[PDB]
Amino acid sequence: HHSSGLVPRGSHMTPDFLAIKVGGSLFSRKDEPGSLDDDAVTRFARNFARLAETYRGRMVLISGGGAFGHGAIRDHDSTHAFSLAGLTEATFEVKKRWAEKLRGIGVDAFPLQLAAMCTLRNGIPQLRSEVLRDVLDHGALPVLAGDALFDEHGKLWAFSSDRVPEVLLPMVEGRLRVVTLTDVDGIVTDTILPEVDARSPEQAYAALWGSSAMHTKLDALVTCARRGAECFIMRGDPGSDLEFLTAPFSSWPAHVRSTRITTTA
C-alpha cells in the first residue's frame, strides 16, 4: 500500500466535477455533410449553460463529432494514417459551434483542441498540456471533442469523444460524474440495465452482442468507474432540464432512466 486521499463516495454524495458528453446523434445527421441542427444546439446550450453556472470551473462539455467527425474518418486514406489529420479540423468545427452558441448566452465557453493537449502512449491517452487545468481554474467552460491523436511512434489514431472523460481521470480531484447523452435510454438487455459494476461488467457487454458506438462508451465509462467516477449512459433531448445532474443520484427524479456504471460506492 501507497497512501492516498480517502474520498467519500456514494449515491448520497454530490459530484465535484461534471463531464457531460453530447452525442452526435442528438444534433447532427452523420449522412448529411456539415449538418448541424442549430435548434438542437441552441436548446441544449441553454440547459448546459445552467449546469456550467453551478459547476463553474468544475465542468467540461464534450461534443460528439456528428457529420463532421464521421465525414473526416470516411474521407481519409487508411494507407496514410496522416490523412486522419483532417479529423482534428472537423472536430474543431463542432467545438466552435458549441462554444459560439454558449458564449451567445453568457457562458465563458472556450474550445480546446485535444490533439494539442494529449497524446497516446501504450494506447493510454496522456494529458500533456497544463492549459486545461488553467482554463478550469479561471472558471471557464472547456468545450472538448474527440480528435486525431499522435502516438509515441507518430501514428495518428481516431480518438472518440466517448473516451475523452478518460483524459480527466488524473486531473480531477474529488468525485467525477460522467454523463453520456445518447439516443437510447441506456444499455438495453428488452429492458434497460440500470446498474453495471465496473469491476465485473461482463453482462453489459453481453447485451451489446444481443443488440450490436455503444462498445466504445461502455469501455470508456468502465475505465472511468474503475478510477472512482460515477458514470451514466442516458437519453439526451434538447429541451430536457438537466438540473438533476447537479444532485446526488439518490435524489434524482423518478422519471429519469439511465445505465449507471460504478464500482462499490
Ligand X SMILES: C[C@@H]1O[C@@H]1P(=O)(O)O
Ligand Y SMILES: Nc1ncnc2c1ncn2[C@@H]1O[C@H](COP(=O)(O)OP(=O)(O)OP(=O)(O)O)[C@@H](O)[C@H]1O
Q: Is 149 in the site for ligand Y (CB under 6 A)?
A: no
Residue 144 zone, left/alpha/beta (φ > 0; ψ -120 to 50; rest): beta
**By CB under 6 A, what part of segment 90-109 binds ligand X?**
91
Position among 11, 14, 211, 251 found at the interface with ligand Y (CB under 6 A): 211
Closest approach of a copy of itself to the CB of residue 104, in Å: 10
Choose the one of ligand Y, a copy of itself, ligand X, none that binds residue 112, judging by a C-beta under 5 to 8 angstroms depending on kind.
a copy of itself
Cell of 224: 472511468
Of 90, 98, 153, the C-alpha closest to 120 is 153
Q: CA–CA separation, 20 vs 84, rounded Å?
A: 25
Closest approach of ligand X to the CB of residue 213, in Å: 8
Closer Cβ to ligand Y, 176 or 234, answer by number: 234
Cell of 73: 474518418
Q: CA–CA separation, 179 vs 20, rounded Å?
A: 5
Cell of 173: 480531484
**By CB under 6 A, what part of segment 39-78 binds ligand Y?**
64, 66
Q: Is 71 in the site for ligand X (CB under 6 A)?
A: no
3-state secondary structure of 193: coil
Q: CA–CA separation, 159 vs 148, rounded Å?
A: 6
Choose the one of ligand X, a copy of itself, ligand Y, none that binds residue 211, judging by a C-beta under 5 to 8 angstroms depending on kind.
ligand Y
Of 16, 56, 13, the C-alpha closest to 171 is 16
Q: Is 24 in the site for ligand X (CB under 6 A)?
A: yes
- Cα maximum dimension of the chain: 53
Asked if residue 231 lies in contact with residue 262, where contact means CB atoms within 8 angstroms, the answer is yes
Q: Is 160 in the site for ligand X (CB under 6 A)?
A: yes
**By CB under 8 A, what part of segment 73-92 binds a copy of itself?**
82-83, 85-86, 88-89, 92
Stretch that binds ligand Y, among 2-10, 121-129, 211-219, 249-257 (CB under 6 A): 211-219
Q: Is 118 in the site for ligand X (CB under 6 A)?
A: no
Residue 213 labeled ligand binder: yes
Residue ranges at the known binding site: 21-25, 30, 65-66, 70, 161, 182-183, 188, 207, 209, 211, 213, 217
Residue ranges at the known binding site for substrate: 65, 70, 161
